[PDB]
Design an enzyme around this catalytic site. Structure first.
Site: not given
Ligand SMILES: O=C(O)[C@H]1CNC[C@@H](O)[C@@H]1O
Ligand SMILES: O=C(O)[C@H]1CNC[C@@H](O)[C@@H]1O
Lengths: 596, 589
Positions: A166, A417, A473, A511
């Site tokens: 990303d 990730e 998230y 994150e």
């Protein structure tokens, strides 16, 4: 390595000349440069700033989005007095891969876009004359080098990068370029490691030179006063009443490494270092034997127009913002940054988790980018993974060799990730971790950032880590907005599962965040509003604070940053706590107040 | 000048080493640095990037807004081989004024924040050793130096700059710094001027060196082939079948100036130049004997975080944007820019109006913030203005891109005092410019055609007008157009037979503010305003150029009339087009 990673210096023995400025630049869509002699000069170049990413200068899509081979060229006058030296071109980086030519001759090639490229031009250099450098660069993405992605060929033959990550595929000569001169016998590498002995400290060291002459090592304090001296390529410097490098309270000694032949000095290398220890003890991260709770951000090398182009001004503003939030730490998400970032962290007492560019290794993302148009059946991991591992290990070796002597660097992050839920992934990462430990003289903490797919019940790789970094998230990608209470329940459920495992290791959230459009206000809040960013963060803090073993929080991201365009990215990623021009959204004060 | 303005180069005779990077920096609010040995090193510095403006790094108001004395320091290793060269520190600029120290010794001082500062450290330099440079800088504004303003003292002793100009008072070391080595006898200056002879051209030149040895001058084409060679410090190079430097179609020769000792060379200076002529003939601006209509912008040196800090990346993006609009020209509003801007304009075939920082010379704005040219400080201001003019012209004269000098922006011009003042400035400029190229300045609306005493000094006249913004904006825009035409009819009636160029016109425009029907501040109003202005421009034969204010949104002093700086940009501060950018692109195509 067959070259030195040492940052260049200027003294009686070593010389350096910057090649930064406007270079010549030419795209090579037909891949004809080498057979057409472009290594002797580009036939129809445009001007291109160095350092910078090339993409955002142009006003047309095809140039911005260019993917494939492209070339840079410049000329420089080499001082006659460099005659009797080893002469090297030193690129801070070449993104992503390239071949360096000098005076028409092929010098070296490099794979990996975020670490120095050293090209020995001693045999072709012309002292007292104008010299030429030409670089063939390629910015395609594949599954055998880092970071990972694909390259799509459009109907017209035009290439398009398709990241599995990303962030925008910025490329070019993004960091400063030097030409340097070294003594024929030189300091190629050294390593320091520290031990605390009450009020005193020991600096254990090793030095690698390109010859057999004796080495002397001295340590100077911040005032330039000699505090220790010893002889030999391996030794220990004993420092009485050592002034330790402390979090947000740096102190830097200067190490001085001399090669001598008895008659005189052959080379001198000097660098600032800080006496500090880092270790994991149970669920605690110990800096100089005291627990530290990490507070800060993942960042990027990202700024308007320059792209990933290095500039000290970005460093200065970013550190002022970091200090204003009361942060103490950042992660170099998702690639090693320019060396200058670490030099400055050393000065400012910031802690760094230094991350190799092992991002884009999630299967679902790969499959998605293949399904776009179009493919659902053909993938060849059995063949590419062994080559990827070699690339990953090489980048790891380069990163650690470059960065090990920064007191700021307290941990290596070896992935962001990836797939971790198979025994195959374990075997892959075991090799990477083994290599990292081998290359790090300090054997400091090793980790990686895990995506939610790495469930506590499934992940095979967390036991390799000294502490565990989680990217989560809950409240953004999972149960966002009206479902945020459910998100908190799901988050606590996961953390309860980690808790029940009783791993006795620290966890750091590397994150967590929400896309937030500066100026979007709503009462009650909505996803994308400034108010929702605040509420999401407050919810996350409540969760973090419920678990003893959570020992750090690095928010995603310090600042809004560029990504590939698409239906999920509104001019890049807006999870910044600051805007791209480094101004605070409402959530910045939430961090400031909490971290105070 | 007792130093050279020549851009530094690296060759067999000349060396250069960049001092850019993180410098040490310390504010000096109590003004005690020179009393306290700071010239030997700062006692409690922080790190500061160079080149950059210092202001926008900090997170606190008092540091951002700092006004007064502040100091920079760095250290550099000087190669042993530089021994017995003339060794100089060369600052691209020191904003606004400063004193340079090296190894604890005072070297030189300079007034003027937008042109090079040369400090001869030959006598204190330590070759083969670490050397130190310390600079005391001051960024206050006054009425005896440019640009003009005042300095306010707040009840706690804290100074605050109060500009008489509409741009933020950025300061510090905003351009690159070099240490350089020159031969004992060196090329100090040269000048070129051009004459077109059919398919051929003459390059007339003069060279100034620091000695008496013979000079040889060569001209190489873009491939490095010798096309002309002559001997003497004054001469003419004859170029057969000359490839002219053309608007948006540059060609650059390389001039090579050698000092010889008979069997050897003592110095060599090389620079790219372009063969082109510019002249005003009647109401036309002639470039290589053909009329050109100027199309472009006033700019600034302004970018997020860096402030006025120079970066080639800003140059590259800005030029790509300029080309995309089909522009051919910019004005260096309101100060000479870093040299690199002109080097690039030369390569890209852009025309530049090069402007000295004579801005803030207004009595209204002066009186409000605080009869401008009647103040006893004026004789001193004139000296500063002339000095900056000499420096600008000496620095920039050999760029083919530089086709005019702007010697002021919006001063008072309606008194005999102003005329006498500007007569001196123009006379000085003329003496410094080997080419005697067109001289002008940008006039504010207060310089009414019936009252202005200074327009006769100008080779062509530049007007800044805001009919439809500051005058009869919004619902009154039809009245604005009538008023604009009334003024232009008054200029027309004078039958001056000179070109007029509009050097400013624009509207503050917030990106994303859309309204139907339009309102002042909206993107749509910017378009409508521009269309109205074009109708007026196109009604007068003698109007021969339009430079919009501004290329991009830029930083100003905070206030009730500035919503995060000036929003009259056609592009945003990060260089993206508002709706109006397309209007220019289509018109200028
Ligand atoms: O989706 C996001 O915002 C983040 C998710 N984790 C990885 C980041 O690179 C990415 O930017
Ligand atoms: O008011 C404005 O927008 C402009 C008026 N003329 C002078 C410019 O510096 C100023 O920025």
């Amino acid at each position: 390595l067959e070259y030195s990673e040492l940052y260049p210096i200027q003294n009686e023995y070593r010389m350096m000349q910057s090649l930064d400025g406007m270079w010549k630049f030419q795209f090579d869509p037909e891949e004809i440069g080498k057979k057409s002699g472009w290594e002797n000069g580009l036939p129809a170049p445009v001007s291109m700033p160095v350092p910078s990413s090339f993409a955002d200068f142009f006003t047309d899509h095809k140039e911005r989005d260019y993917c494939g081979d492209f070339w840079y060229e410049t000329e420089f006058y080499l001082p006659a007095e460099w005659r009797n030296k080893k002469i090297w071109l030193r690129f801070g980086s070449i993104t992503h891969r390239g071949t360096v030519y000098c005076n028409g001759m092929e010098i070296t090639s490099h794979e990996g876009g975020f670490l120095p490229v050293l090209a020995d031009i001693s045999t072709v250099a012309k002292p007292g004359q104008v010299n030429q450098v030409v670089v063939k660069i390629n910015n395609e993405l594949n599954e055998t080098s880092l970071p990972c992605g694909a390259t799509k060929i459009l109907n017209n033959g035009r290439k398009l990068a398709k990241p599995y990550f990303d962030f925008f595929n910025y490329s070019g000569l993004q960091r400063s370029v030097w030409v340097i001169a070294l003594p024929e016998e030189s300091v190629k590498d050294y390593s320091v490691d520290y031990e605390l002995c009450g009020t005193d400290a020991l600096v254990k060291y090793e030095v690698v030179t390109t010859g057999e002459h004796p080495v002397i090592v001295r340590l100077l304090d911040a005032e330039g006063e000699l505090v220790a001296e010893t002889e030999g390529k391996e030794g220990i410097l004993q420092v009485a009443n050592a002034r330790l490098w402390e979090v947000r309270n740096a102190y830097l000694y200067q190490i001085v490494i001399l090669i001598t032949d008895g008659n005189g000095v052959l080379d001198e290398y000097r660098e600032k270092i800080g006496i500090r220890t880092v270790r994991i003890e149970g669920t605690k991260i110990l800096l100089n034997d005291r627990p530290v709770y990490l507070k800060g951000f993942g960042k990027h090398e990202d700024f308007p127009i320059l792209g990933r182009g290095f500039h000290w001004g970005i460093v200065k503003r970013d550190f002022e913002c970091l200090k204003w939030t009361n942060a103490n730490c950042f992660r170099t998400s998702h690639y090693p940054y320019a060396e200058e970032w670490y030099q400055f962290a050393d000065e400012e007492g910031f802690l760094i988790i230094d991350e190799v560019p092992a991002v884009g290794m999630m299967r679902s993302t790969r499959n998605f980018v293949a399904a776009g148009s179009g493919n659902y059946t053909y993938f060849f991991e059995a063949l590419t993974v062994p080559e990827l591992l070699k690339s990953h290990i090489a980048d790891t070796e380069e990163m650690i060799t470059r960065d090990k002597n920064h007191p700021s660097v307290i941990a290596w992050s070896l992935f962001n990730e990836p797939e971790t839920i198979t025994d195959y992934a374990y075997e892959y990462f075991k090799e990477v971790f083994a290599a990292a430990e081998t290359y790090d003289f300090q054997s400091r903490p090793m980790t990686g950032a895990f995506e939610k797919n790495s469930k506590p019940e499934l992940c095979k790789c967390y036991p390799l880590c000294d502490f565990i970094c989680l990217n989560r998230y809950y409240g953004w990608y999972i149960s966002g907005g009206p479902e945020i209470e459910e998100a908190e329940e799901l988050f606590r459920d996961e953390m309860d599962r980690w808790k029940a495992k009783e791993l006795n290791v620290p966890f750091v959230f590397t994150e967590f965040g929400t896309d937030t459009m500066a100026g979007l206000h709503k009462l009650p809040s909505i996803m994308w509003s400034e108010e929702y960013q605040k509420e999401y963060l407050e919810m996350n803090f409540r969760v973090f604070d419920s678990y003893e073993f959570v020992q750090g929080e690095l928010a995603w991201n310090f600042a809004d940053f560029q990504t590939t365009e698409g239906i999920m990215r509104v001019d890049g990623n807006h999870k910044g706590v600051f805007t791209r021009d480094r101004q605070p959204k409402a959530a910045a004060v939430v961090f400031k107040d909490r971290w105070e």
